Short mmCIF file of C-alpha atoms in Angstrom, two decimals:
data_model
loop_
_atom_site.label_atom_id
_atom_site.label_comp_id
_atom_site.label_asym_id
_atom_site.label_seq_id
_atom_site.Cartn_x
_atom_site.Cartn_y
_atom_site.Cartn_z
CA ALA E 2 170.74 106.46 -161.42
CA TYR E 3 168.85 104.06 -159.11
CA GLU E 4 166.70 105.78 -156.45
CA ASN E 5 165.79 109.49 -156.25
CA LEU E 6 164.87 109.28 -159.96
CA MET E 7 161.45 108.62 -161.46
CA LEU E 8 162.96 106.83 -164.48
CA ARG E 9 166.04 104.69 -164.94
CA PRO E 10 168.43 106.53 -167.30
CA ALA E 11 169.19 103.89 -169.94
CA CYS E 12 169.28 100.18 -170.78
CA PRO E 13 172.07 98.43 -172.71
CA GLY E 14 171.76 97.71 -176.41
CA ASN E 15 169.55 100.70 -177.25
CA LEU E 16 170.17 103.86 -179.25
CA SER E 17 170.68 107.04 -177.25
CA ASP E 18 170.23 109.84 -179.80
CA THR E 19 168.44 110.08 -183.15
CA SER E 20 171.39 111.31 -185.22
CA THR E 21 172.44 109.49 -188.41
CA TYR E 22 172.08 105.84 -187.38
CA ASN E 23 172.34 102.79 -189.62
CA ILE E 24 170.95 99.34 -188.77
CA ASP E 25 171.72 96.22 -190.78
CA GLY E 26 168.83 93.78 -191.03
CA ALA E 27 170.40 90.96 -193.05
CA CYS E 28 172.37 89.12 -190.38
CA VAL E 29 172.43 85.63 -188.86
CA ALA E 30 173.75 84.57 -185.45
CA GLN E 31 176.21 81.72 -184.88
CA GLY E 32 176.14 81.65 -181.07
CA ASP E 33 174.35 83.25 -178.16
CA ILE E 34 174.73 87.03 -178.39
CA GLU E 35 173.69 89.47 -175.67
CA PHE E 36 172.50 93.02 -176.23
CA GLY E 37 175.47 95.33 -176.36
CA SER E 38 178.92 93.87 -177.02
CA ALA E 39 180.69 94.09 -180.38
CA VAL E 40 180.37 91.39 -183.05
CA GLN E 41 182.51 90.05 -185.89
CA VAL E 42 181.68 89.04 -189.46
CA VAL E 43 182.73 85.41 -189.93
CA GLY E 44 181.50 85.17 -193.51
CA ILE E 45 178.83 86.09 -196.02
CA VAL E 46 176.42 83.45 -197.36
CA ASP E 47 174.16 84.55 -200.23
CA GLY E 48 174.11 88.17 -199.12
CA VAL E 49 173.55 87.82 -195.37
CA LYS E 50 176.32 88.16 -192.78
CA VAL E 51 177.05 85.51 -190.13
CA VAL E 52 177.95 87.47 -186.99
CA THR E 53 179.50 86.10 -183.79
CA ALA E 54 180.45 87.51 -180.42
CA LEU E 55 183.83 89.22 -180.36
CA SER E 56 186.85 86.95 -179.82
CA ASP E 57 190.66 87.26 -179.88
CA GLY E 58 192.19 88.57 -183.09
CA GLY E 59 188.96 89.88 -184.59
CA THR E 60 188.00 93.39 -185.62
CA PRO E 61 184.65 94.58 -184.21
CA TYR E 62 181.93 95.47 -186.70
CA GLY E 63 178.88 96.69 -184.78
CA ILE E 64 176.84 96.58 -181.58
CA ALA E 65 173.84 94.29 -181.15
CA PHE E 66 170.45 95.99 -181.08
CA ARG E 67 167.44 95.32 -178.85
CA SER E 68 164.16 94.42 -180.55
CA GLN E 69 161.09 93.41 -178.55
CA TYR E 70 159.51 91.34 -181.35
CA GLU E 71 162.37 89.31 -182.81
CA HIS E 72 163.91 88.11 -179.53
CA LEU E 73 161.46 87.06 -176.81
CA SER E 74 164.08 85.61 -174.44
CA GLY E 75 166.25 88.58 -173.43
CA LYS E 76 169.12 87.59 -175.74
CA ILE E 77 169.87 86.61 -179.33
CA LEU E 78 169.90 82.82 -179.71
CA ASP E 79 171.66 80.64 -182.26
CA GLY E 80 170.25 80.56 -185.78
CA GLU E 81 168.23 83.76 -185.34
CA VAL E 82 168.21 86.89 -187.49
CA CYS E 83 169.35 90.01 -185.66
CA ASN E 84 169.87 93.75 -186.06
CA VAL E 85 173.36 95.24 -185.77
CA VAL E 86 174.08 98.95 -185.34
CA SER E 87 176.80 99.44 -187.94
CA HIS E 88 176.68 103.21 -187.46
CA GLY E 89 175.23 105.56 -184.86
CA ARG E 90 175.36 106.20 -181.12
CA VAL E 91 174.47 103.25 -178.88
CA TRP E 92 174.75 102.21 -175.22
CA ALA E 93 177.30 99.42 -174.82
CA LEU E 94 178.57 97.16 -172.02
CA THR E 95 181.77 97.94 -170.13
CA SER E 96 183.91 96.50 -167.35
CA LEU E 97 185.05 99.88 -166.02
CA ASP E 98 184.35 101.98 -162.94
CA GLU E 99 185.39 105.50 -164.04
CA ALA E 100 184.47 107.44 -167.16
CA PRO E 101 187.47 107.83 -169.51
CA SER E 102 188.58 111.06 -171.11
CA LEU E 103 186.13 112.65 -173.53
CA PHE E 104 186.45 111.70 -177.21
CA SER E 105 188.89 108.90 -176.33
CA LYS E 106 189.13 105.81 -178.52
CA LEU E 107 187.80 102.79 -176.64
CA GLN E 108 189.21 99.26 -176.64
CA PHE E 109 187.23 96.01 -176.67
CA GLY E 110 187.99 92.61 -175.19
CA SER E 111 186.45 89.42 -173.81
CA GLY E 112 182.90 89.03 -175.15
CA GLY E 113 182.72 92.46 -176.73
CA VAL E 114 182.80 94.34 -173.42
CA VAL E 115 184.85 97.53 -173.16
CA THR E 116 187.98 97.02 -171.05
CA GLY E 117 189.62 100.44 -171.32
CA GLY E 118 190.40 103.50 -173.40
CA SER E 119 193.66 105.04 -174.62
CA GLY E 120 193.42 103.34 -178.01
CA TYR E 121 195.02 104.30 -181.31
CA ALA E 122 192.22 103.87 -183.86
CA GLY E 123 188.54 103.02 -183.68
CA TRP E 124 185.30 104.24 -182.14
CA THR E 125 185.14 107.05 -179.60
CA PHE E 126 183.65 107.63 -176.16
CA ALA E 127 180.71 110.03 -176.18
CA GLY E 128 179.38 111.82 -173.12
CA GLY E 129 177.63 109.21 -171.02
CA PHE E 130 178.21 106.94 -168.03
CA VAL E 131 175.41 105.27 -166.04
CA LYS E 132 175.17 102.50 -163.45
CA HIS E 133 173.39 99.24 -164.33
CA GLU E 134 172.73 96.32 -161.97
CA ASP E 135 176.25 95.71 -160.66
CA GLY E 136 178.40 97.64 -163.11
CA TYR E 137 178.28 100.56 -165.51
CA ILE E 138 177.15 101.30 -169.06
CA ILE E 139 179.19 103.34 -171.54
CA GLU E 140 178.04 105.27 -174.61
CA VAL E 141 179.88 104.48 -177.84
CA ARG E 142 179.94 106.61 -181.00
CA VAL E 143 179.98 103.94 -183.71
CA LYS E 144 181.39 105.00 -187.07
CA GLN E 145 181.43 102.88 -190.21
CA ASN E 146 184.77 102.18 -191.92
CA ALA E 147 186.62 102.64 -188.61
CA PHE E 148 188.29 99.25 -188.04
CA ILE E 149 190.15 97.80 -191.03
CA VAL E 150 190.96 94.08 -190.88
CA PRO E 151 194.74 93.64 -191.09
CA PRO E 152 196.24 92.04 -194.20
CA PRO E 153 197.51 88.49 -193.64
CA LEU K 214 158.34 120.07 -147.98
CA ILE K 215 160.88 117.76 -146.33
CA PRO K 216 163.40 115.16 -147.51
CA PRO K 217 162.41 111.51 -146.91
CA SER K 218 164.71 111.12 -143.91
CA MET K 219 163.40 113.93 -141.75
CA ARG K 220 160.11 112.03 -141.99
CA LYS K 221 161.90 109.33 -140.00
CA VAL K 222 163.16 112.07 -137.68
CA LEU K 223 159.68 113.54 -137.04
CA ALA K 224 157.84 110.24 -136.46
CA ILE K 225 158.73 109.85 -132.77
CA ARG K 226 156.03 110.39 -130.17
CA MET K 227 156.61 113.43 -127.99
CA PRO K 228 158.03 112.57 -124.52
CA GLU K 229 154.76 112.59 -122.55
CA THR K 230 151.96 113.49 -124.98
CA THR K 231 149.63 111.62 -127.36
CA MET K 232 150.92 113.21 -130.58
CA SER K 233 153.91 112.85 -132.89
CA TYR K 234 156.13 115.66 -134.14
CA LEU K 235 154.59 115.24 -137.61
CA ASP K 236 151.04 115.89 -136.31
CA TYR K 237 151.55 118.87 -133.99
CA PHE K 238 152.98 120.88 -136.89
CA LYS K 239 150.13 119.56 -139.06
CA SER K 240 147.59 120.89 -136.53
CA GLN K 241 148.70 124.54 -136.50
CA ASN K 242 147.10 127.60 -138.15
CA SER K 243 144.20 126.06 -140.08
CA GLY K 244 145.96 123.03 -141.54
CA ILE K 245 149.51 122.36 -142.70
CA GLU K 246 150.21 119.69 -145.34
CA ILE K 247 153.53 117.89 -145.01
CA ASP K 248 154.85 115.74 -147.87
CA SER K 249 158.25 114.37 -148.85
CA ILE K 250 160.05 115.45 -152.02
CA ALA K 251 162.93 113.28 -153.25
CA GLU K 252 164.92 116.05 -154.98
CA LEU K 253 165.53 117.85 -151.65
CA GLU K 254 168.30 115.43 -150.64
CA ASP K 255 170.70 117.25 -153.00
CA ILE K 256 170.28 120.99 -153.52
CA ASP K 257 173.91 121.88 -154.29
CA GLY K 258 176.58 119.70 -155.88
CA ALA K 259 177.76 117.73 -152.85
CA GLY K 260 174.76 117.74 -150.53
CA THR K 261 172.94 119.97 -148.06
CA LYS K 262 169.29 118.81 -147.70
CA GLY K 263 166.68 121.56 -147.44
CA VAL K 264 163.19 122.34 -146.18
CA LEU K 265 160.63 124.81 -147.53
CA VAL K 266 157.85 126.55 -145.59
#
């Protein structure tokens, strides 16, 4: 990336390939959510889902999507409708420096940022690793019905 | 075609003339046209840097 290239490779929170994607449009935000980073489903009120940034003890649901009409501030603010990529292939945010093994199940922590691989169940790492600002961007192959919330 | 570092190399004035290394080569034959291509800083996997005439 960076110099010696006419175009920057990719930007976080955007789809990479046009292959069987699904975007939910009936969602509401509880706190400030940044593009990329997994989200939870706190509850459902009259059909819509109230999504929050990932926290401890919560199963991720999807990755936030970038729209240039809904959000005119560079991030999703409180009390704003948002799009969530429930299924597809999207660029996410990571706190890594080296690309993991191919088709390895990623792990999420902190505010929905990827901390490492070598998981047991969940989404997988596609082929992609680019540099962004001060850090890297990872490509995540989101699949629906991947994380099952544990029984109490 | 040169990488954009050899342009820095060939910008020095010649020891005791009134021309730079980038102009004497430009003044030969009828006219030579030097420009810098960015992809020539990596021709193989690691790096070699190349020039085409």
